[PDB]
Amino acid sequence: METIAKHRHARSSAQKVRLVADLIRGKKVSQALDILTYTNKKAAVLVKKVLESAIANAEHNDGADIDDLKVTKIFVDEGPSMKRIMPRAKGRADRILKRTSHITVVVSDR
Amino acid sequence: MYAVFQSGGKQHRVSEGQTVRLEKLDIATGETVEFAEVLMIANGEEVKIGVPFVDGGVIKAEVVAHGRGEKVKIVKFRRRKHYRKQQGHRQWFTDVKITGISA
Amino acid sequence: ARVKRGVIARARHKKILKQAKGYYGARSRVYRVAFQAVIKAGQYAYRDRRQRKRQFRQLWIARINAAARQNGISYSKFINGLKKASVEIDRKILADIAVFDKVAFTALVEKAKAALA
Amino acid sequence: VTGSGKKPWRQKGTGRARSGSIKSPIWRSGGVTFAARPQDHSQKVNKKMYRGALKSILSELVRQDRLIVVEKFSVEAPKTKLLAQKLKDMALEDVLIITGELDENLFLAARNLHKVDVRDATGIDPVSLIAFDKVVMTADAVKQVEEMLA
Amino acid sequence: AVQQNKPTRSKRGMRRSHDALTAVTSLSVDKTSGEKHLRHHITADGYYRGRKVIAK
Amino acid sequence: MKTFTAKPETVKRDWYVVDATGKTLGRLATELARRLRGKHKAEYTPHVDTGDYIIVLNADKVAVTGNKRTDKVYYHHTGHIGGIKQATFEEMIARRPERVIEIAVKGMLPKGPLGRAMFRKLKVYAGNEHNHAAQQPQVLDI
Amino acid sequence: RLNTLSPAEGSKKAGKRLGRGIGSGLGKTGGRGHKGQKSRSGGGVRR
RNA sequence: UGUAACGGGGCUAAACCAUGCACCGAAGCUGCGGCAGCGACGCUUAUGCGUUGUUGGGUAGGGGAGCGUUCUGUAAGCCUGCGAAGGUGUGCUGUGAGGCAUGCUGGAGGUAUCAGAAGUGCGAAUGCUGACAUAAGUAACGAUAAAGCGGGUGAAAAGCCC
RNA sequence: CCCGGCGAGGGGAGUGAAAAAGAACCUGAAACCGUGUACGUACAAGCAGUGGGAGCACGCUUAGGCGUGUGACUGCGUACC
Ligand SMILES: [Mg+2]
Ligand SMILES: [Mg+2]
Ligand SMILES: [Mg+2]
Ligand SMILES: [Mg+2]
Ligand SMILES: [Mg+2]
Ligand SMILES: [Mg+2]
Ligand SMILES: [Mg+2]
Ligand SMILES: [Mg+2]
Ligand SMILES: [Mg+2]
Ligand SMILES: [Mg+2]
Ligand SMILES: [Mg+2]
Ligand SMILES: [Mg+2]
Ligand SMILES: [Mg+2]
Ligand SMILES: [Mg+2]
Ligand SMILES: [Mg+2]
Ligand SMILES: [Mg+2]
Ligand SMILES: [Mg+2]
Ligand SMILES: [Mg+2]
Ligand SMILES: [Mg+2]
Ligand SMILES: [Mg+2]
Ligand SMILES: [Mg+2]
Ligand SMILES: [Mg+2]
Ligand SMILES: [Mg+2]
Ligand SMILES: [Mg+2]
Ligand SMILES: [Mg+2]
Ligand SMILES: [Mg+2]
Ligand SMILES: [Mg+2]
Ligand SMILES: [Mg+2]
Ligand SMILES: [Mg+2]
Ligand SMILES: [Mg+2]
Ligand SMILES: [Mg+2]
Ligand SMILES: [Mg+2]
Ligand SMILES: [Mg+2]
Ligand SMILES: [Mg+2]
Ligand SMILES: [Mg+2]
Ligand SMILES: [Mg+2]
Ligand SMILES: [Mg+2]
Ligand SMILES: [Mg+2]
Ligand SMILES: [Mg+2]
Ligand SMILES: [Mg+2]
Ligand SMILES: [Mg+2]
Ligand SMILES: [Mg+2]
Ligand SMILES: [Mg+2]
Ligand SMILES: [Mg+2]
Ligand SMILES: [Mg+2]
Ligand SMILES: [Mg+2]
Ligand SMILES: [Mg+2]
Ligand SMILES: [Mg+2]
Ligand SMILES: [Mg+2]
Ligand SMILES: [Mg+2]
Ligand SMILES: [Mg+2]
Ligand SMILES: [Mg+2]
Ligand SMILES: [Mg+2]
């Protein structure tokens, strides 16, 4: 069983997150939990919590056995961006997008 | 062993059993055509054409169905001069399987 | 009688874009750019069709020459010979025997060297 | 288009393009370059050409045995089911039926029968005279029309 | 100063070919307690090179 | 049927040797040039390297004609400041004679990738011998 | 038969549409050439 | 700025003159197949044709003939939950604008034909409105009055509380 | 029910013809951004295509040296208004 888990509207960029996601794609779940643990980036906690949830799903909703689980697929897409306004000198007003990500993890064995 | 001959306004070299495509011939969808103007025949020793066409040379083959090739776009465009016309074209052909080749 | 306009709009755009498959960057992604990229390809096409016959002829020739050169003769004379040889009309592309049936080509260098003499 | 005629922004100085009225047919919210107006699509049709046309289309119905003419034609009471029968009986389902002086019963019949309508002679219009499969028309009427096209 | 043409998504990527993050592959196991730790770092439970230090 | 086409993975080649001695540098370069480009066979494939491998003995002893031996250009620019560099035929023959046959034929071979490659088929050597015995080259003329 | 009749050959003809592309025959400039008074929306000279 | 006054290599002929014979060379000419326009022959006339001669670069611009869209009639008809419109592949088709078939999606509308009427076709107008790239994960986080530690609380504490 | 901070978010289960209608909810196009796969790419110079074309990877018919994706190398080649 493939079994996935995703975090939508993550309060991170995507570019920012994709970095962490990259550290992890296609590793043994067990080791991903370590890699993630020692990565000093907001995004890590985010992705970590997804992986974990994927696992608990794949463990409680399917065959399971963490030991034989690999993050076969991980991929973060982009969420909708909260637009704000930024006061700038001389009356000018700028945009600024506070962006969001759609973090997805997929954990299986085969 | 092979022969070369005029057909569609162009020449082809060929063996018997072999199929070649030519400019549309007004010949029945199945009948047998004769190409009385071959201009070479081959072996370990071969007959080039003193004049054009070897003496008593002639090829046989049956028309193996007609056709139209794939479509080609004719695009014309005169940048800055407000002009362009596009026009399509296909082009008929008939195929033959070459049975003959009598030297 | 207001007219929708924009489903047939889609229509064309999709059609042009279609023909842009392969073109790099926005050449295949963005209509403005696609559309130009498409139009020129049709030009380059029209052109190269006639160019095609050119390119090939001058290929056949060079190799025919290579072959006659091997047989102790320059393309020029050869072809002149073949020409003078009781007429003797027979394509340059057809003189591909040059490539495959070598002994045959050699048999022409003769039929030519002869009438040429 | 409701809204002020004030210039949206200075002619020169801002990167922006022109702009004269926020009702520019090229601007959004409001415009229509040649905004339509109620119009009278009536034509003229010369009398003699109108009479010409009927006398024409008429003639053709005959050539196609689509005009079946009859002496008198009616129904003794206002009951569609009645008209329904007469028509079933005569093998008509798509009919114009143009009566002489036009009665009343016949009228309230077919006023619910889809493929049939009843007019008097002085009625009869050109398009419908074509539309229906079969036009009936009583001899009484054929007279009124005869002299109406002279 | 500003670009005159828009940079490709392709060039953008190359710029980032050096932006990848490096895993760790530098973590060890305290000899006294099972503990995984950053080399030269006190353990979660408060050990280091065997030997509980840091009471708390 | 589509005309023949030499495939890279099946081309002949064959080594050869030449002594470019009293030969006029350039009337020789020309024949070299063409043999590299395979212009004497089934070159019939100008998008494929079908030439042979030729090696050139005694580059130093190369013929010139007219005052060329002492009046010849030979200019490069190092790309700096104003670094134009010039040396003369005789001066080239002094340091690295082999370079002369190279720059000559290199200017008679085409543009880029292909030509660039056809040129790796031409081993020079200024002295009389060479170390390609292994390929056992057969000698030719012109 | 209400859809078998038609107007006599020639009766009702097209009607220049103009401003509608190249192949159209009068796109751009809509057949009124280049610049000057006589182009221009409402550009003319009294009788 | 750099060889920089044959395009290059290179040439004593690969320059120059004379003569002769070749060859290469264009969308010119020819050959084969195909379309159209403007003519007339010959077969033979609600005339198309073996045709047959000739013609078919094109801005402004004129003339001609068509495509598709929206709405009206033809339509209480034809198609359609045994799957409409729209989206999206694919195949076929016309000289082209286009057309048809069909997988997937979609899930309720669509309309042949011949006519009728136009808010009828967009890449540009520093066009209008929305969405989204770019620079870039760069500048910057708003007075250089300043922070440190222990303890708490908390899922988490440089910023909260003591 | 499960992971999560008594979260957000998500996976199950169940409802429904459909959740490939889950409430930012019909259809869900384009730009723009990603994951996977095939083919290419780290000695090579320019409107990026077009003409030729090896290899590689998948459809032809019972091989016919075709088609499709890619495209080494190569002729030509300065977008549009
Ligand atoms: Mg911006
Ligand atoms: Mg409407
Ligand atoms: Mg695309
Ligand atoms: Mg030509
Ligand atoms: Mg208003
Ligand atoms: Mg005022
Ligand atoms: Mg001022
Ligand atoms: Mg600007
Ligand atoms: Mg309005
Ligand atoms: Mg009146
Ligand atoms: Mg960087
Ligand atoms: Mg030089
Ligand atoms: Mg030098
Ligand atoms: Mg070149
Ligand atoms: Mg007109
Ligand atoms: Mg015009
Ligand atoms: Mg005018
Ligand atoms: Mg103008
Ligand atoms: Mg004017
Ligand atoms: Mg100088
Ligand atoms: Mg010159
Ligand atoms: Mg011509
Ligand atoms: Mg001629
Ligand atoms: Mg012809
Ligand atoms: Mg006659
Ligand atoms: Mg014309
Ligand atoms: Mg012409
Ligand atoms: Mg209709
Ligand atoms: Mg509709
Ligand atoms: Mg059509
Ligand atoms: Mg409009
Ligand atoms: Mg647009
Ligand atoms: Mg325009
Ligand atoms: Mg960015
Ligand atoms: Mg920067
Ligand atoms: Mg910086
Ligand atoms: Mg900074
Ligand atoms: Mg500041
Ligand atoms: Mg501050
Ligand atoms: Mg503290
Ligand atoms: Mg502080
Ligand atoms: Mg829990
Ligand atoms: Mg929840
Ligand atoms: Mg879904
Ligand atoms: Mg769906
Ligand atoms: Mg939706
Ligand atoms: Mg999309
Ligand atoms: Mg590349
Ligand atoms: Mg470059
Ligand atoms: Mg090709
Ligand atoms: Mg397979
Ligand atoms: Mg397949
Ligand atoms: Mg190319």
JSON list of N, CA and C (backbone and C1' of nucleotides) in Angstrom, two decimals, chain H residues 138-156:
[
{"chain": "H", "resi": 138, "resn": "U", "atom": "P", "xyz": [18.15, 35.22, 0.48]},
{"chain": "H", "resi": 138, "resn": "U", "atom": "O5'", "xyz": [18.38, 36.59, -0.31]},
{"chain": "H", "resi": 138, "resn": "U", "atom": "C5'", "xyz": [19.67, 36.87, -0.86]},
{"chain": "H", "resi": 138, "resn": "U", "atom": "C4'", "xyz": [19.70, 38.13, -1.72]},
{"chain": "H", "resi": 138, "resn": "U", "atom": "C3'", "xyz": [19.52, 39.47, -1.00]},
{"chain": "H", "resi": 138, "resn": "U", "atom": "O3'", "xyz": [20.75, 39.97, -0.50]},
{"chain": "H", "resi": 138, "resn": "U", "atom": "C1'", "xyz": [18.15, 39.36, -2.96]},
{"chain": "H", "resi": 139, "resn": "A", "atom": "P", "xyz": [20.80, 40.91, 0.81]},
{"chain": "H", "resi": 139, "resn": "A", "atom": "O5'", "xyz": [19.78, 42.09, 0.48]},
{"chain": "H", "resi": 139, "resn": "A", "atom": "C5'", "xyz": [20.23, 43.24, -0.25]},
{"chain": "H", "resi": 139, "resn": "A", "atom": "C4'", "xyz": [19.31, 44.44, -0.08]},
{"chain": "H", "resi": 139, "resn": "A", "atom": "C3'", "xyz": [18.95, 44.85, 1.34]},
{"chain": "H", "resi": 139, "resn": "A", "atom": "O3'", "xyz": [19.94, 45.68, 1.93]},
{"chain": "H", "resi": 139, "resn": "A", "atom": "C1'", "xyz": [17.00, 44.77, 0.01]},
{"chain": "H", "resi": 140, "resn": "A", "atom": "P", "xyz": [20.17, 45.73, 3.52]},
{"chain": "H", "resi": 140, "resn": "A", "atom": "O5'", "xyz": [18.71, 45.95, 4.10]},
{"chain": "H", "resi": 140, "resn": "A", "atom": "C5'", "xyz": [18.08, 47.22, 4.05]},
{"chain": "H", "resi": 140, "resn": "A", "atom": "C4'", "xyz": [16.62, 47.13, 4.40]},
{"chain": "H", "resi": 140, "resn": "A", "atom": "C3'", "xyz": [16.32, 46.66, 5.81]},
{"chain": "H", "resi": 140, "resn": "A", "atom": "O3'", "xyz": [16.30, 47.73, 6.74]},
{"chain": "H", "resi": 140, "resn": "A", "atom": "C1'", "xyz": [15.07, 45.40, 4.25]},
{"chain": "H", "resi": 141, "resn": "C", "atom": "P", "xyz": [16.70, 47.50, 8.28]},
{"chain": "H", "resi": 141, "resn": "C", "atom": "O5'", "xyz": [15.43, 46.74, 8.87]},
{"chain": "H", "resi": 141, "resn": "C", "atom": "C5'", "xyz": [14.39, 47.47, 9.51]},
{"chain": "H", "resi": 141, "resn": "C", "atom": "C4'", "xyz": [13.31, 46.55, 10.00]},
{"chain": "H", "resi": 141, "resn": "C", "atom": "C3'", "xyz": [13.67, 45.70, 11.20]},
{"chain": "H", "resi": 141, "resn": "C", "atom": "O3'", "xyz": [13.49, 46.38, 12.43]},
{"chain": "H", "resi": 141, "resn": "C", "atom": "C1'", "xyz": [12.72, 44.33, 9.52]},
{"chain": "H", "resi": 142, "resn": "G", "atom": "P", "xyz": [14.59, 47.43, 12.94]},
{"chain": "H", "resi": 142, "resn": "G", "atom": "O5'", "xyz": [13.98, 48.81, 12.45]},
{"chain": "H", "resi": 142, "resn": "G", "atom": "C5'", "xyz": [14.83, 49.89, 12.10]},
{"chain": "H", "resi": 142, "resn": "G", "atom": "C4'", "xyz": [14.07, 51.18, 12.08]},
{"chain": "H", "resi": 142, "resn": "G", "atom": "C3'", "xyz": [13.18, 51.45, 13.26]},
{"chain": "H", "resi": 142, "resn": "G", "atom": "O3'", "xyz": [13.90, 51.92, 14.37]},
{"chain": "H", "resi": 142, "resn": "G", "atom": "C1'", "xyz": [12.04, 51.99, 11.27]},
{"chain": "H", "resi": 143, "resn": "A", "atom": "P", "xyz": [13.62, 51.31, 15.81]},
{"chain": "H", "resi": 143, "resn": "A", "atom": "O5'", "xyz": [14.69, 52.04, 16.73]},
{"chain": "H", "resi": 143, "resn": "A", "atom": "C5'", "xyz": [14.93, 53.44, 16.60]},
{"chain": "H", "resi": 143, "resn": "A", "atom": "C4'", "xyz": [16.13, 53.72, 15.75]},
{"chain": "H", "resi": 143, "resn": "A", "atom": "C3'", "xyz": [17.46, 53.75, 16.50]},
{"chain": "H", "resi": 143, "resn": "A", "atom": "O3'", "xyz": [18.53, 53.41, 15.61]},
{"chain": "H", "resi": 143, "resn": "A", "atom": "C1'", "xyz": [17.01, 55.88, 15.60]},
{"chain": "H", "resi": 144, "resn": "U", "atom": "P", "xyz": [19.06, 51.89, 15.45]},
{"chain": "H", "resi": 144, "resn": "U", "atom": "O5'", "xyz": [20.40, 51.87, 16.34]},
{"chain": "H", "resi": 144, "resn": "U", "atom": "C5'", "xyz": [20.47, 52.53, 17.61]},
{"chain": "H", "resi": 144, "resn": "U", "atom": "C4'", "xyz": [21.81, 52.33, 18.30]},
{"chain": "H", "resi": 144, "resn": "U", "atom": "C3'", "xyz": [22.47, 53.60, 18.82]},
{"chain": "H", "resi": 144, "resn": "U", "atom": "O3'", "xyz": [21.98, 53.97, 20.08]},
{"chain": "H", "resi": 144, "resn": "U", "atom": "C1'", "xyz": [24.07, 52.26, 17.69]},
{"chain": "H", "resi": 145, "resn": "A", "atom": "P", "xyz": [20.84, 55.08, 20.19]},
{"chain": "H", "resi": 145, "resn": "A", "atom": "O5'", "xyz": [20.53, 55.12, 21.74]},
{"chain": "H", "resi": 145, "resn": "A", "atom": "C5'", "xyz": [21.58, 55.17, 22.69]},
{"chain": "H", "resi": 145, "resn": "A", "atom": "C4'", "xyz": [21.33, 54.25, 23.84]},
{"chain": "H", "resi": 145, "resn": "A", "atom": "C3'", "xyz": [20.87, 52.83, 23.49]},
{"chain": "H", "resi": 145, "resn": "A", "atom": "O3'", "xyz": [21.95, 51.97, 23.14]},
{"chain": "H", "resi": 145, "resn": "A", "atom": "C1'", "xyz": [19.49, 53.73, 25.18]},
{"chain": "H", "resi": 146, "resn": "A", "atom": "P", "xyz": [21.74, 50.79, 22.07]},
{"chain": "H", "resi": 146, "resn": "A", "atom": "O5'", "xyz": [21.32, 49.57, 22.97]},
{"chain": "H", "resi": 146, "resn": "A", "atom": "C5'", "xyz": [21.39, 48.24, 22.49]},
{"chain": "H", "resi": 146, "resn": "A", "atom": "C4'", "xyz": [21.17, 47.26, 23.59]},
{"chain": "H", "resi": 146, "resn": "A", "atom": "C3'", "xyz": [20.12, 47.68, 24.62]},
{"chain": "H", "resi": 146, "resn": "A", "atom": "O3'", "xyz": [19.38, 46.54, 25.07]},
{"chain": "H", "resi": 146, "resn": "A", "atom": "C1'", "xyz": [22.15, 47.27, 25.71]},
{"chain": "H", "resi": 147, "resn": "A", "atom": "P", "xyz": [19.04, 45.35, 24.04]},
{"chain": "H", "resi": 147, "resn": "A", "atom": "O5'", "xyz": [20.40, 44.51, 24.01]},
{"chain": "H", "resi": 147, "resn": "A", "atom": "C5'", "xyz": [20.45, 43.18, 24.52]},
{"chain": "H", "resi": 147, "resn": "A", "atom": "C4'", "xyz": [21.65, 42.96, 25.41]},
{"chain": "H", "resi": 147, "resn": "A", "atom": "C3'", "xyz": [21.63, 41.69, 26.25]},
{"chain": "H", "resi": 147, "resn": "A", "atom": "O3'", "xyz": [22.07, 40.55, 25.54]},
{"chain": "H", "resi": 147, "resn": "A", "atom": "C1'", "xyz": [22.13, 43.52, 27.63]},
{"chain": "H", "resi": 148, "resn": "G", "atom": "P", "xyz": [21.54, 39.08, 25.97]},
{"chain": "H", "resi": 148, "resn": "G", "atom": "O5'", "xyz": [22.18, 38.89, 27.41]},
{"chain": "H", "resi": 148, "resn": "G", "atom": "C5'", "xyz": [23.58, 38.73, 27.57]},
{"chain": "H", "resi": 148, "resn": "G", "atom": "C4'", "xyz": [23.94, 38.33, 28.97]},
{"chain": "H", "resi": 148, "resn": "G", "atom": "C3'", "xyz": [23.21, 37.12, 29.52]},
{"chain": "H", "resi": 148, "resn": "G", "atom": "O3'", "xyz": [23.77, 35.90, 29.09]},
{"chain": "H", "resi": 148, "resn": "G", "atom": "C1'", "xyz": [23.19, 38.85, 31.12]},
{"chain": "H", "resi": 149, "resn": "C", "atom": "P", "xyz": [22.85, 34.59, 28.96]},
{"chain": "H", "resi": 149, "resn": "C", "atom": "O5'", "xyz": [22.55, 34.25, 30.48]},
{"chain": "H", "resi": 149, "resn": "C", "atom": "C5'", "xyz": [23.60, 33.88, 31.35]},
{"chain": "H", "resi": 149, "resn": "C", "atom": "C4'", "xyz": [23.13, 33.73, 32.76]},
{"chain": "H", "resi": 149, "resn": "C", "atom": "C3'", "xyz": [21.90, 32.86, 32.96]},
{"chain": "H", "resi": 149, "resn": "C", "atom": "O3'", "xyz": [22.21, 31.48, 32.95]},
{"chain": "H", "resi": 149, "resn": "C", "atom": "C1'", "xyz": [21.64, 34.86, 34.17]},
{"chain": "H", "resi": 150, "resn": "G", "atom": "P", "xyz": [21.04, 30.37, 32.84]},
{"chain": "H", "resi": 150, "resn": "G", "atom": "O5'", "xyz": [20.33, 30.47, 34.24]},
{"chain": "H", "resi": 150, "resn": "G", "atom": "C5'", "xyz": [21.01, 30.08, 35.41]},
{"chain": "H", "resi": 150, "resn": "G", "atom": "C4'", "xyz": [20.15, 30.29, 36.63]},
{"chain": "H", "resi": 150, "resn": "G", "atom": "C3'", "xyz": [18.76, 29.68, 36.57]},
{"chain": "H", "resi": 150, "resn": "G", "atom": "O3'", "xyz": [18.75, 28.29, 36.83]},
{"chain": "H", "resi": 150, "resn": "G", "atom": "C1'", "xyz": [18.58, 31.90, 37.30]},
{"chain": "H", "resi": 151, "resn": "G", "atom": "P", "xyz": [17.64, 27.36, 36.14]},
{"chain": "H", "resi": 151, "resn": "G", "atom": "O5'", "xyz": [16.30, 27.90, 36.78]},
{"chain": "H", "resi": 151, "resn": "G", "atom": "C5'", "xyz": [16.23, 28.13, 38.17]},
{"chain": "H", "resi": 151, "resn": "G", "atom": "C4'", "xyz": [14.88, 28.63, 38.57]},
{"chain": "H", "resi": 151, "resn": "G", "atom": "C3'", "xyz": [13.71, 28.07, 37.78]},
{"chain": "H", "resi": 151, "resn": "G", "atom": "O3'", "xyz": [13.37, 26.74, 38.16]},
{"chain": "H", "resi": 151, "resn": "G", "atom": "C1'", "xyz": [13.45, 30.39, 37.98]},
{"chain": "H", "resi": 152, "resn": "G", "atom": "P", "xyz": [12.22, 25.96, 37.37]},
{"chain": "H", "resi": 152, "resn": "G", "atom": "O5'", "xyz": [10.94, 26.82, 37.73]},
{"chain": "H", "resi": 152, "resn": "G", "atom": "C5'", "xyz": [9.69, 26.50, 37.19]},
{"chain": "H", "resi": 152, "resn": "G", "atom": "C4'", "xyz": [8.78, 27.69, 37.18]},
{"chain": "H", "resi": 152, "resn": "G", "atom": "C3'", "xyz": [7.68, 27.62, 36.16]},
{"chain": "H", "resi": 152, "resn": "G", "atom": "O3'", "xyz": [6.61, 26.83, 36.60]},
{"chain": "H", "resi": 152, "resn": "G", "atom": "C1'", "xyz": [8.70, 29.73, 36.04]},
{"chain": "H", "resi": 153, "resn": "U", "atom": "P", "xyz": [6.41, 25.37, 36.00]},
{"chain": "H", "resi": 153, "resn": "U", "atom": "O5'", "xyz": [5.13, 25.59, 35.08]},
{"chain": "H", "resi": 153, "resn": "U", "atom": "C5'", "xyz": [4.19, 26.62, 35.40]},
{"chain": "H", "resi": 153, "resn": "U", "atom": "C4'", "xyz": [3.76, 27.38, 34.17]},
{"chain": "H", "resi": 153, "resn": "U", "atom": "C3'", "xyz": [3.64, 26.58, 32.89]},
{"chain": "H", "resi": 153, "resn": "U", "atom": "O3'", "xyz": [2.45, 25.82, 32.82]},
{"chain": "H", "resi": 153, "resn": "U", "atom": "C1'", "xyz": [4.74, 28.64, 32.45]},
{"chain": "H", "resi": 154, "resn": "G", "atom": "P", "xyz": [2.49, 24.30, 32.29]},
{"chain": "H", "resi": 154, "resn": "G", "atom": "O5'", "xyz": [2.57, 24.48, 30.73]},
{"chain": "H", "resi": 154, "resn": "G", "atom": "C5'", "xyz": [1.69, 25.36, 30.06]},
{"chain": "H", "resi": 154, "resn": "G", "atom": "C4'", "xyz": [2.20, 25.71, 28.69]},
{"chain": "H", "resi": 154, "resn": "G", "atom": "C3'", "xyz": [2.70, 24.54, 27.86]},
{"chain": "H", "resi": 154, "resn": "G", "atom": "O3'", "xyz": [1.65, 23.82, 27.21]},
{"chain": "H", "resi": 154, "resn": "G", "atom": "C1'", "xyz": [4.29, 26.28, 27.81]},
{"chain": "H", "resi": 155, "resn": "A", "atom": "P", "xyz": [1.69, 22.20, 27.13]},
{"chain": "H", "resi": 155, "resn": "A", "atom": "O5'", "xyz": [2.84, 21.94, 26.06]},
{"chain": "H", "resi": 155, "resn": "A", "atom": "C5'", "xyz": [3.28, 20.64, 25.77]},
{"chain": "H", "resi": 155, "resn": "A", "atom": "C4'", "xyz": [4.01, 20.61, 24.44]},
{"chain": "H", "resi": 155, "resn": "A", "atom": "C3'", "xyz": [5.09, 21.67, 24.25]},
{"chain": "H", "resi": 155, "resn": "A", "atom": "O3'", "xyz": [6.32, 21.31, 24.83]},
{"chain": "H", "resi": 155, "resn": "A", "atom": "C1'", "xyz": [3.69, 21.60, 22.34]},
{"chain": "H", "resi": 156, "resn": "A", "atom": "P", "xyz": [6.98, 22.23, 25.97]},
{"chain": "H", "resi": 156, "resn": "A", "atom": "O5'", "xyz": [7.86, 23.25, 25.13]},
{"chain": "H", "resi": 156, "resn": "A", "atom": "C5'", "xyz": [8.88, 22.78, 24.26]},
{"chain": "H", "resi": 156, "resn": "A", "atom": "C4'", "xyz": [9.01, 23.64, 23.02]},
{"chain": "H", "resi": 156, "resn": "A", "atom": "C3'", "xyz": [9.55, 25.05, 23.23]},
{"chain": "H", "resi": 156, "resn": "A", "atom": "O3'", "xyz": [10.97, 25.07, 23.27]},
{"chain": "H", "resi": 156, "resn": "A", "atom": "C1'", "xyz": [7.64, 25.10, 21.82]}
]
